[PDB]
Design a protein around this ligand. Structure first.
Ligand SMILES: *[C@@](C)(CO)[C@](*)(O)[C@H](Cc1ccccc1)NC(=O)[C@H](Cc1c[nH]c2ccccc12)NC(=O)[C@@H](C)NC(=O)CN1CCOCC1
Ligand SMILES: [Mg+2]
Lengths: 231, 240, 250, 222, 235, 211, 244, 233
């Protein structure tokens, strides 16, 4: 009300409204799902178009051979943050000859987002990210919020109508975690999960976007007729 | 440093500071530009609220940017000096790095770029000035007349006016200026420029300044008596 | 962090007033009375030592300050603002003059430098004006004795005699009747003590009054002998005893 | 006084075929008269069917290769996984080298691969960035020993057709991969004999449309 | 007052949303992408008859294989064009090749959100970036001041955009020829323009693989207008 | 190296050798010492190969940007000056670059000499490199404004040959260019080994050499 | 943050005026009147000190008239402290020009430089403008005797006669009435004092309430002399012209 | 640019079937003066890596601190710091190599020669060298300074190539290292009798041996040597 003019101002109940408004931009964004087993980790994203003449906005970005994310909210902010991750993944390789741990990647994103919430002049990031990766401790899935909060999860979803997919994963928890050494069945579970967030529209060939990373699988993105198999 | 964003968008999609800068131009004295077949003339109003003025030393309204290009303006006088200085520096800088004098179009594009930069830079306000830039390109006999404004847009004109009561003199020029046959001589071009100012000026005494620019760096400013002869001839034809 | 106040805090109002300067002058009005009188062979500056508590040692708080050996200063208004101005005034007398010309600045030029500092606080970004008016008395070879007033705006005026602060209006009237161009220094000190008694409520003695003069050279206060041209400071602060002696002949 | 440069010896050799290309280099690393390693790889697969070798000062050579490999990575990120052509890689390397025009990478650099028409390509660089496409190039310590041999046995220089007596040249027939590898092995065997910094091992990287293949051969260890 | 980089309660940047309103006031620009090329066309909209209309430059060359049309506060576009041209030629310097249309568009869009308290406000102009490369063929992009860019088969921006976009919805198909696209831009421009369309107050341009980016002559456009009138009178 | 270039009736000729050295060692037999900046602009090279390539390819970047902004081809006078201004920024830093900027513009054919010191000279004829003195000898005695394109091409070709023969650090091959108002025209790569014997027989020159 | 407390000194009104410049001009209108009159053989500068006291040391005082160099002087109207900042800058610019070209600075060039500084405070920096209006009186060998004025907007104009400060409307009318082109310095001196005598808010115009100066070629042969009048000399010229 | 003051001499090392061995004497020389006799130049990093350093001792102590800080920093927000995400020899080496090459590129080098010896997660042996120039190389045997000239020849008789590593036991490798250290004591003027030795095995872990001495030295034949040519008495 009087305490939402900038990010440097607490409300009387201890809330940061500019951060909460940035969180709102994620809810307006298109749905995206993340889930993992012990061997692989999967991202599934519903892409959005402007109209029938337009293309479908890309949702998934690669950060390294072993790491990448999907976005929901302001796409340019995802480009800034994914660029930062690319550089950090790359600094780890060039200096330490070491692939960047997914957990440490989350810690770096948290700290970058936080600086924007405590300083005058700037603004919070207006995007939520789902980071998947495979490192020395196996498969991982992270959820990033622009408040700074990063959370390691078995599965999750963000965007509009994401609560439906999140409930499905909460039921299926015991099943999909056990899908080891079977990438196609893990993607099936992700496609079935994101389907719980659909209304009116359904999954078409240029609508669906899938990504996967695993034990002997580099981070690869599937679009177009490459995802027709899963429709 | 002072970084405050003064020029910003409003809910209806307007930049008020840029629009209020145009109001300062509306307040400024009238300036007019007319291009003939082989020349361009720049007319300028002098408000007669200020007498006891020393006309020898008072800053003239038309300024030479180079030997072949001139610049007149309407709006804040102090603001215009900054644009003129920058333009003059760029003119010598172009000669120094490219070995050709600036084209009128290039010089205009630079001045317009400066005005634009002051509409999306922190800590600064837009120039309260619109300019008429006229001249002839090196080794070219085609006349050039351009206009700029605080927003930074620019364009070429067969004839144009800016400043206070510019709406009236533009009305006059639109019906009197024929594109198929522009003022063939210098006389006809000056006569049409004086006529257009007489719609607005008040007295035709020391209120009208005229500057003729011809090809190959031939620039001259008319005197009071020379202009007064045009004023006399126009009204004597009007009494009929 | 960073000082993000890069804009003026003092601005013109529709009526043409500079509010913060006017308000600074109001703070000066509330301040304790101080005065200055110029004689033929000297200058005197004086003020009341308004002690905040009787437990406080008022000798440690110096309202009258030496700027150069031949220039002194007194104020009315906010004490802390005065203290930092004296520090800057002492330094600028060296950096912008003595280190260049090898001698101390004349009164009018040091005043000019102080005035400049106070003007900048009236225009620079993220600062308020100084809440003091200064009276600067001094002597130099080519201008002789002089007395200047300096206001929060940075404006300064030379005076034969004047007063600033609480009871300045009454005190300036008192000085107009008593001042003439033939006054000796002792006569000016006498008038200063008379003028200052009118604005003081409580105790009036050497311990509650601070008074200094710009007069003859004091070779006893120089600290060394051997150089004929160096004859000592003209600034001298009167002692508690020296004040009381002149209060008996009052 | 501190000398930031050093000489780690070695020699490299690039030959372009009609539909293939080879980049070979010895595996010996040295300082002065000592041997550091008998097997220290010098020719690298940089991705996108490009092979590269920076010969001279090992520290500067490793840094350049490391930077180019990084440049390829960022080329994919920035331009939608587009394949970096050999001509585009060559130009990119020129700018990497000229970055240090006033504190150079003390290396002679060669890259090899296939052009956009599928033909074999070799590009050669100097330490400060001048590059050019070539059919044949030896670089490093024994470059002056090998290059004349390649002018003779690859481009048939000073060779004419018998009976004509200098009137008609030897025609420029193309070479097969098997014929090229023979010339490479004979070049390094000869260089090992007469140059003290060359020896221990020979590693060859062959580039075709099918990918990048390696071949290793022993050399004299004295 | 309030921050320049402030979020609204709905999760949108105030300044970006307000700049979009300025673009709605701008003159109409239309782009249509085909397999034979991409066509770009604009409304010039001269404020007076004395203004020499050929000096109105709302269609601009970025490279030989990339063109650009603009709508909104057109003065803001000059620095964007300058950056685009520099980016296009700089990439040619570093990589000895033409730059991808998408990569060029992305480079322009990176400037968009560089505003705060960098420039003091977002750009007040939208761009239609049309071009061709070997990888993705003929392309048309719409670059906004939000930093977002969408690819389009056909797109209209400016004051008559939603009316023109509905018309482009019905008319566009994947087998359009270049000549058909030219007439289609002229048809829709004539429909949304205030003044009567002619060769002096409207401009056409195209980008083909062979000839590259070309702005059409007033004589060439005049014939296409006459060809349009006759084919509309044909039924 | 040896480079030359000269104006004449039908435009400008530009001829260069192809050798590259690393002390006494001939590092390259076939190097391109000309850069096609644009269809109407050429750039010769002499000195540090890296400097010549980097700065003239950077000049080409700057000449292309001029065309995009002004919608007009850059002049030879302006192009040569941009290059000389670049040299003046790295003045004293140790660059080694001698070049001729050849082209055709509105004023007709243009030829400018530019070097690392920032020197910029307009003229009808120039020759740079270690073997320029040999080339000047042939040029000065045979040059006319009234030359035919066929004779002019031969003169520049023959002038490089003269230098390639005597100068140890010049040779390999000759690259010819002819600049017209329709643009420049490449006139081939000519091996000096073969060209020498051909010229000796046909011209009768080099009598001192046995063949 | 800090934005909350920013007055925004460099913005336009809806009518296209600069708020702070207009308010600074309002400040100057309450300042003591200063008059400049240019004649064929010299220039006069007259100015009124504001409500003085008997205890003010006049002979060592300077609030209105300042010397920029040997050829150029200025009369001040507004905040004295602000004026001294600008005066010292102008004195430096004059010396920089002299060091560079080995010639005394032309009057207009000095005036333009100061006016450009004033302009800068209205367009950028976020600081308040200088609440000062100058009358420049000077001589150079190009244009001869010259009068200029500058105000907080940074706009400057040339004059034959001009006033700044209080009652300029009334003062300008009186000057416009009695001024003629063939006028001489002694006549201009009389006009300046007569104008102040009629426009003053004080009961009577006396020597202690005035600062006065002339720039004359009345120096031995082809050269120019600046005369800042002493209190006794102002008293004499008041009797001579018949005001006291 | 500087000059080394207090210096440490040769560091020698080699691979064997199940791990690596590294050794270095305990001397800190001040030119020809054998100033400091208790200096440890082998510095363990975790339980899987040992860094051996020669050259300037002040720069060695600086590096020692960088490594100590590296371990601290790796443990930050890392639950697997003593397991999967522990520091590896390849990580530690590349860090140092990055530092060494950066310092030489600023013309302010760390005047050292470093050998990183250790065993990786997968049981693979790690042995790589880096120096003040940023020059890196790997070999079955590695040695710095004098060791390069005298020790490598002896150690290469045991492991001449890669295929000889599985055939080499820890007893044979240690014996070879200890003999090499004796030879260096005979022939290096800036060496000492006292030295430290470290073994990093993939089964038995890190064994760090201190206060070792060169023994079984041959000197008796010196009694028979008389004069420099013609002297008999
Ligand atoms: C004569 C050959 C002079 O000796 C020419 O000027 C020639 C000019 C030239 C221009 C462009 C491309 C190639 C050649 N200059 C050189 O060849 C030059 C001579 C040279 C050597 N050190 C120099 C220092 C300062 C000035 C000139 C110098 N040589 C080079 O630049 C050498 C170092 N570069 C190469 O040989 C580069 N090639 C090596 C093999 O791989 C392809 C690149
Ligand atoms: Mg050998």
């Amino acid at each position: 009300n009087n305490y939402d003019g900038d990010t440097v101002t607490f409300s009387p109940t201890g809330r940061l409204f500019q951060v909460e408004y940035a969180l709102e931009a994620i809810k307006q964004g298109s749905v995206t799902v993340g889930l993992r087993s012990n061997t692989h980790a999967v991202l599934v994203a519903l892409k959005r178009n402007a109209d029938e003449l337009s293309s479908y906005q890309k949702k998934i970005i690669k950060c390294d051979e072993h790491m990448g994310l999907s976005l929901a909210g302001l796409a340019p902010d995802a480009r800034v943050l994914s660029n930062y991750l690319r550089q950090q993944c790359n600094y780890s390789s060039l200096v330490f000859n070491r692939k960047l741990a997914v957990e440490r990647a989350g810690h770096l994103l948290c700290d970058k987002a936080q600086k924007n919430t405590q300083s005058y002049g700037g603004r919070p990031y207006g995007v939520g990210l789902l980071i998947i990766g495979y490192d020395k401790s196996g498969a991982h899935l992270l959820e990033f919020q622009p408040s700074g909060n990063v959370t390691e999860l078995y599965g999750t979803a963000i965007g509009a109508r994401s609560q439906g997919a999140k409930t499905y994963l909460e039921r299926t928890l015991d099943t999909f975690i056990k899908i080891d050494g079977n990438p196609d069945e893990l993607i099936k579970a992700g496609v079935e999960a994101i389907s719980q967030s659909l209304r009116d529209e359904s999954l078409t060939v240029d609508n669906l976007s899938i990504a996967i990373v695993g034990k002997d699988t580099p981070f690869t993105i599937y679009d177009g007729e490459a995802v027709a198999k899963y429709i | 440093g002072y970084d405050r964003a003064l020029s910003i968008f409003s809910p209806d999609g307007h930049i008020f500071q840029v629009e209020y800068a145009l109001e300062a131009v509306k307040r400024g004295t009238c300036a007019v530009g007319v291009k003939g077949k082989n020349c361009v003339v720049l007319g300028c109003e002098r408000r007669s609220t200020l007498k006891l003025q020393d006309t020898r030393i008072t800053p003239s309204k038309v300024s030479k940017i180079d030997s072949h290009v001139v610049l007149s303006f309407s709006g804040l006088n102090a603001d215009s000096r900054i644009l003129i200085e920058k333009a003059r520096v760029e003119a010598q800088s172009h000669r120094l790095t490219l070995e050709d004098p600036v084209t009128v179009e290039y010089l205009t594009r630079y001045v317009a770029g400066v005005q634009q930069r002051y509409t999306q830079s922190g800590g600064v306000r837009p120039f309260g000035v619109s300019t008429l830039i006229a001249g002839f390109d090196p080794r070219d006999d085609e006349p050039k007349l351009y206009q700029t404004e605080p927003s930074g847009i620019y364009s070429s004109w067969s004839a144009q006016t800016i400043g206070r009561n510019s709406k009236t003199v533009r009305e006059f020029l639109e019906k009197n200026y024929d594109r198929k046959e522009p003022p063939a001589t210098v006389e006809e071009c000056v006569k049409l420029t004086v006529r257009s100012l007489l719609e607005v000026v008040q007295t035709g005494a020391k209120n009208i300044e005229i500057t003729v620019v011809k090809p190959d760096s031939d620039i001259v400013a008319l005197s009071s008596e020379e202009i007064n002869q045009y004023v006399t001839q126009i009204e004597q034809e009007k009494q009929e | 962090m960073t000082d993000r106040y890069s804009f003026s805090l003092t601005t013109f109002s529709p009526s043409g007033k500079l509010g913060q300067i006017d308000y600074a002058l109001t703070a000066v009005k509330q301040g304790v009375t101080s005065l200055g009188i110029k004689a033929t062979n000297g200058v005197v500056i004086a003020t009341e030592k308004k002690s905040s508590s009787p437990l406080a040692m008022s000798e440690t708080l110096s309202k009258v300050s030496l700027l150069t050996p031949d220039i002194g200063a007194v104020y009315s208004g906010m004490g802390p603002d005065y203290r930092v101005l004296v520090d800057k005034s002492r330094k600028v007398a060296h950096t912008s003059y003595k280190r260049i010309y090898g001698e101390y600045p004349p009164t009018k030029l040091l005043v000019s430098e102080v005035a400049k500092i106070m003007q900048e606080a009236t225009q620079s970004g993220g600062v308020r004006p100084f809440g003091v008016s200064l009276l600067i008395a001094g002597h130099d070879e080519f201008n002789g004795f002089s007395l200047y007033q300096v206001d929060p705006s940075g404006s300064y005026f030379p005076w034969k005699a004047t007063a600033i602060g609480k009871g300045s209006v009454a005190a300036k009237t008192f000085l107009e009747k008593r001042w003439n161009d033939e006054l000796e220094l002792e006569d000016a000190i006498h008038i200063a003590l008379l003028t200052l008694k009118e604005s003081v409520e409580g105790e009036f003695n050497g311990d509650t009054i601070e008074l200094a003069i710009i007069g003859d050279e004091n070779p006893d206060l120089l600290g060394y002998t051997g150089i004929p041209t160096d004859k000592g400071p003209r600034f001298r602060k009167l002692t508690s005893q020296e004040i009381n002696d002149r209060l008996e002949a009052l | 006084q501190f000398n930031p440069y050093g000489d780690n010896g070695g020699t490299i050799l690039g030959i372009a075929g009609e539909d293939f290309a080879v980049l070979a280099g010895d595996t010996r690393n040295i300082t002065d008269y000592s041997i550091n390693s008998r097997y220290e790889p010098k020719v690298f697969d940089c991705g996108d069917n490009i092979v590269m070798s920076a010969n001279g000062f090992a520290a500067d050579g490793d840094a350049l290769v490391k930077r180019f490999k990084n440049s390829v990575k960022w080329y994919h990120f920035d331009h939608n996984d587009k394949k970096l052509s050999i001509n585009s890689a060559a130009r990119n390397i020129q700018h990497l080298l000229y970055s240090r025009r006033f504190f150079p990478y003390y290396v002679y650099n060669i890259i090899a691969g296939l052009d956009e028409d599928g033909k074999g390509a070799v590009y050669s660089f100097d330490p400060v960035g001048s590059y050019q496409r070539e059919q044949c190039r030896a670089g490093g310590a024994a470059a002056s020993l090998i290059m004349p041999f390649l002018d003779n046995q690859v481009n048939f220089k000073n060779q004419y057709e018998p009976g004509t007596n200098g009137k008609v040249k030897k025609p420029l027939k193309y070479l097969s991969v098997e014929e090229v590898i023979k010339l490479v092995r004979d070049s390094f065997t000869s260089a090992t004999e007469r140059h003290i910094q060359v020896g221990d091992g020979l590693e060859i990287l062959i580039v075709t449309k099918d990918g990048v293949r390696k071949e290793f051969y022993e050399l004299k260890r004295d | 007052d309030r921050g320049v980089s402030t979020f609204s309660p709905e999760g949108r940047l105030f300044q970006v949303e307000y700049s979009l309103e300025a673009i709605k006031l701008g003159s109409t620009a239309i782009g249509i992408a085909t397999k034979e090329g991409v066509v770009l066309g604009v409304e010039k909209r001269a404020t007076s008859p004395l203004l020499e209309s050929d000096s109105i430059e709302k269609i601009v060359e970025i490279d030989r294989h990339i063109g650009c049309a603009m709508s909104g506060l057109t003065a803001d576009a000059r620095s964007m064009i300058e950056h685009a041209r520099t980016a296009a030629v700089t990439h040619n310097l570093y990589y000895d090749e033409d730059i991808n249309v998408e990569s060029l568009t992305q480079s322009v869009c990176d400037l968009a959100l560089r505003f705060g308290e960098l420039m003091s406000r977002p750009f007040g102009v939208a761009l239609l970036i049309a071009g061709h490369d070997a990888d993705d063929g003929y392309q048309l992009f719409h670059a906004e001041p939000s930093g977002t860019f969408y690819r389009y088969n056909a797109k209209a921006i400016g004051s008559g955009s939603e009316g023109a976009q509905a018309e482009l919805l019905n008319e566009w198909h994947s087998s359009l020829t270049l000549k058909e696209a030219e007439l289609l831009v002229l048809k829709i421009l004539k429909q949304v323009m205030e003044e009567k369309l002619d060769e002096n107050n409207a401009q056409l341009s195209c980008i083909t693989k062979q000839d590259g980016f070309k702005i059409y002559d007033n004589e060439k456009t005049a014939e296409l207008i006459k060809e349009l009138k006759e084919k509309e009178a044909a039924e | 190296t040896t480079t030359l270039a000269f104006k004449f009736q039908h435009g400008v000729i530009a001829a260069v050798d192809s050798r590259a050295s690393a002390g006494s060692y001939i590092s390259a037999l076939r190097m391109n010492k000309v850069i096609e900046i644009n269809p109407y602009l050429l750039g010769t090279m002499s000195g540090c190969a890296a400097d010549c390539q980097y700065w003239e390819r950077l000049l080409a970047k700057e000449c292309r940007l001029y065309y995009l902004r002004n919608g007009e081809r850059i002049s030879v006078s302006a192009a040569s000056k941009l290059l000389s201004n670049m040299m003046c920024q790295y003045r004293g830093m140790g660059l080694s670059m001698g070049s001729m900027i050849c082209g055709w513009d509105k004023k007709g054919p243009g030829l400018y000499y530019v070097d690392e010191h920032g020197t910029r000279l307009s003229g009808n004829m120039f020759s740079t490199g270690s073997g320029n003195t040999y080339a000047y000898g042939v040029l000065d005695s045979n040059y006319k404004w009234d030359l035919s394109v066929e004779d002019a091409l031969y003169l520049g070709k023959r002038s490089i040959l003269a230098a390639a023969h005597r100068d140890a650090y010049s040779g390999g091959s000759v690259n010819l260019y002819h600049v017209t108002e329709d643009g420049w025209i490449y006139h081939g790569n000519h091996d000096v080994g073969e060209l020498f014997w051909k010229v000796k027989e046909e011209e009768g020159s080099f009598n001192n050499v046995i063949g | 943050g800090s934005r909350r407390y920013d007055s925004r000194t460099t913005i336009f009104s809806p009518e296209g005026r600069l708020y702070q410049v207009e308010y600074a001009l309002e400040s100057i209108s309450h300042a003591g009147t200063a008059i400049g009159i240019m004649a064929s053989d010299g220039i006069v500068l007259a100015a009124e000190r504001k409500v003085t006291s008997t205890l003010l040391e006049q002979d060592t005082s300077t609030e209105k008239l300042y010397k920029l160099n040997d050829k150029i002087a200025v009369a001040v109207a507004g905040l004295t402290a602000d004026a001294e900042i600008l005066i010292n800058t102008a004195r430096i610019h004059a010396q920089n020009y002299l060091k560079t070209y080995n010639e005394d600075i032309p009057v207009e060039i000095l005036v333009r430089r100061l006016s450009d500084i004033k302009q800068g405070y209205t367009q950028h920096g976020g600081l308040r403008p200088f609440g000062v209006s100058f009358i420049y009186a000077g001589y150079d060998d190009r244009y001869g005797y010259q009068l200029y004025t500058s105000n907080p907007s940074g706009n400057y104009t040339g004059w034959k006669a001009i006033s700044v400060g209080a009652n300029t409307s009334a003062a300008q009318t009186l000057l416009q009435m009695d001024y003629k082109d063939d006028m001489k310095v002694d006549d201009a001196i009389e006009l300046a004092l007569k104008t102040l005598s009629k426009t003053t808010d004080s009961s009577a115009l006396t020597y202690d309430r005035l600062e006065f100066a002339t720039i004359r070629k009345g120096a031995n042969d082809g050269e120019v002399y600046q005369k800042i009048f002493k209190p006794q000399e102002i008293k004499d010229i008041l009797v001579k012209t018949g005001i006291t | 640019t500087q000059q080394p003051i207090v210096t440490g001499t040769s560091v020698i090392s080699m691979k064997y079937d199940n791990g690596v061995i590294i050794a270095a004497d305990n001397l800190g020389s001040y030119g020809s003066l054998l100033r400091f006799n208790g200096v440890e130049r082998l510095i363990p990093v975790g339980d899987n890596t040992v860094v051996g350093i020669s050259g300037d001792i002040s720069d060695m102590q600086h590096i020692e601190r960088l490594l100590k800080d590296l371990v601290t920093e790796n443990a930050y927000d890392n639950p697997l710091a003593d397991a999967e995400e522990a520091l590896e020899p390849s990580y530690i080496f590349e860090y140092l190599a990055t530092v060494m090459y950066q310092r030489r590129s600023k013309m302010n080098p760390l005047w050292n020669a470093i050998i990183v010896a250790g065993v990786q997660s997968n049981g693979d042996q790690f042995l790589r060298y880096v120096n003040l120039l940023g020059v890196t190389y790997s070999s079955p045997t590695l040695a710095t300074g004098f060791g390069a000239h005298m020790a490598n020849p002896l150690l290469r008789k045991v492991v001449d190539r890669e295929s000889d590593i599985p055939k080499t036991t820890v007893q044979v490798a240690e014996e070879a290292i200890v003999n090499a250290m004796r030879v260096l004591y005979y022939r290096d003027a800036r060496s000492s009798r006292n030295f430290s030795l470290a073994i990093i095995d993939k089964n038995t872990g890190l064994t760090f041996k201190k206060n070792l001495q060169v023994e079984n030295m041959k000197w008796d034949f010196a009694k028979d040597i008389k004069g420099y040519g013609t002297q008999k008495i």
